[PDB]
Amino acid sequence: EDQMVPS
Amino acid sequence: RYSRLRVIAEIRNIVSSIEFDRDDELFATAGVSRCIKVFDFSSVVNEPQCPIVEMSTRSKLSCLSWNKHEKNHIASSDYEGIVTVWDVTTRQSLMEYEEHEKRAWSVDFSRTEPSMLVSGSDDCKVKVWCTRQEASVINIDMKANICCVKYNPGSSNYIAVGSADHHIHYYDLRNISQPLHVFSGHKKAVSYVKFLSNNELASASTDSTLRLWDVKDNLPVRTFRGHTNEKNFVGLTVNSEYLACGSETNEVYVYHKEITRPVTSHRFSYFISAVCWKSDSPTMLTANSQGTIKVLVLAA
């Protein structure tokens, strides 16, 4: 999934 | 002074980046559709909407940064890790920097040494490049994914680095063995860093806050709350007085830097994905995960 901030 | 955002133009997938050129004359968009589109701002505002240039890319785009001296040059970062400098008049890639080993999330051209640009990546590296050199000039090995990098507006010796480790690492590039300071406060990854001025730094995070910091005396200043941001890159843009950011409620939020809760908000399954002030004016570009672009203006 795109434009997801790494966690 | 302001209570609302007026829609003055609308151009109807995810837009990762929306940015004005050096003169606030053209703006460009980029995102998951693998295309950098350049629009004329005045035409968009005056007319009832075709780009003047489109450049197709190999990979999904995460960020754009126009050159502050060369009108026609713009950098992009992509999901393959490539950092590209393009000329929007010739459509050609001028430089393709391929050292990052994973997705690059951010690129920024320095305002004061305009041949210099910095990028950050899921590969946990910050790389500084010069447009006259094929190899990186500086490499910083960090411990966690880098989500955002930004040059200080007054000097090319300082960069802010927002990390998945929840901290902002503020570096003096003259000695990268340690940062000048590391700002803790955010409770999740730091997704954006943007300067309001030489000494004022703002950040956004998936802890649903923006924060303001003093990079002269290394102090926390203020935390801003109201929007919803737990997952996505939703955009942050600042000027001398205001912060604006997206929300996973498909709303744009504006804060004045002295006030912790919003001055106003605008309702655009969808998230705001990119925002950009027109310098210190009340006008703003905005875009969301459906690909819609709106020009908004703060108004009484």
Numbering used by the authors:
A (entry chain B): 545 to 551
B (entry chain A): 352 to 363, 372 to 407, 411 to 630, 644 to 675
Quoted from the paper:
COP1 contains an N‐terminal zinc finger, a central coiled‐coil, and a C‐terminal WD40 domain, which is essential for proper COP1 function (Deng et al, 1992; McNellis et al, 1994). COP1 regulates gene expression and plays a central role as a repressor of photomorphogenesis by directly modulating the stability of transcription factors that control the expression of light‐regulated genes.
Indeed, CRY1 and CRY2 also contain potential VP peptide motifs within their CCT domains, but their function in blue‐light signaling has not been established. Next, we obtained crystal structures for the different peptides bound to COP1 (1.3–2.0 Å resolution, see Tables EV1 and EV2, and EV4) to compare their peptide binding modes. We found that all peptides bind in a similar configuration with the VP forming the center of the binding site (r.m.s.d. between the different peptides range from ~ 0.3 to 1.5 Å, comparing 5 or 6 corresponding Cα atoms). Chemically diverse amino acids (Tyr/Arg/Gln) map to the −3 and −2 position and often deeply insert into the COP1 binding cleft, acting as anchor residues. These observations may be rationalized by an enlarged VP‐binding pocket in the COP1Lys422Ala mutant, increasing accessibility for the COL3Phe288 anchor residue, and potentially abolishing interactions with CRY1Asp545. Independent of this, it is interesting to note that the hy4‐9 mutant, which replaces the proline in the CRY1 VP peptide motif with leucine, does not show inhibition of hypocotyl elongation under blue light (Ahmad et al, 1995). Similarly, the VP motif in the CCT domain of cryptochromes may become exposed and available for interaction upon blue‐light activation of the photoreceptor (Müller & Bouly, 2015; Wang et al, 2018).
